[PDB]
Amino acid sequence: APVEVTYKNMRFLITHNPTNATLNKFIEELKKYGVTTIVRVCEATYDTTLVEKEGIHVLDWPFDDGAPPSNQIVDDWLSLVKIKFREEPGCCIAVHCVAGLGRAPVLVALALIEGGMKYEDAVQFIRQKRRGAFNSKQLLYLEKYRPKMRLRF
């Protein structure tokens, strides 16, 4: 389920998980939204060689099962956001697991919070665009989440 999220000057795309045989359609869906980077939060699957060749960099930072992202992944994710939108204004960052496990959306949620949103509003903003956005462990994480590096001053 391709779902797009725009807040301030940030844009994110929560995609499905393609297979090697459907990568050409996937790449053109990404380009459609001007996606220039992809973060895989679940065990690797399709081969990235082809995607990269098309100008889309793939980042593999899996969570351990449905557990909240590690501090290392949260740090790198927030850094990616900060650098990508500052070096490529207007671009889009894609993130995905399998379009239903409620893992990928947390990353978008965290970006919204650091961007100024209340975790409550960040969750409703996403939940309204798609179901199964956050598993139980995920929601609790966001509830107790305190900003580590705000986006835009």
Ligand X SMILES: Cc1cc2cn(-c3cccc(C(=O)N/N=C/c4ccco4)c3)cc2cc1C
Breaks (C-N over 2.5 A) in the chain follow: none
Q: Are 92 and 13 contacting, i.e. CB atoms less than 8 angstroms apart?
A: yes
Judged by CB, which is closer to ligand X: 9, or 22?
A: 9
Q: Are 97 and 77 contacting, i.e. CB atoms less than 8 angstroms apart?
A: no
The pattern of x and - marking residues 68 through 107 that bind ligand X according to CB under 6 A reads ----------------------------------------
3 state SS of 27: helix
Closest residue to ligand X using C-beta atoms? 8
Contact between 121 and ligand X per CB under 6 A: yes
Judged by CB, which is closer to ligand X: 46, or 125?
A: 125
Q: How far does Cα 56 stand from its chain's mean position?
A: 14
Contacts of 121 (CB under 8 A, 6+ apart): 112
Letter for the amino acid at 23?
L
Residue 75 appears among annotated catalytic residues: no
Which segments within the chain are labelled E, that is strand? 3-6, 11-15, 35-40, 57-60, 92-96
CB of 114 to ligand X, least distance (A): 12
Residue 97 appears among annotated catalytic residues: yes
Segment interacting with ligand X, rule: CB under 6 A, options 3-11, 23-31, 44-52, 71-79: 3-11
Active-site residue identified among 47, 60, 65, 121: 65
User: Is residue 102 part of an annotated ligand binding site?
Assistant: yes
Q: Which residues contribute to the annotated binding site? A: 98-103
Q: Which residues contribute to the annotated binding site for phosphate? A: 98-103
Interface contacts to ligand X, rule CB under 6 A: 7-9, 121, 125, 152
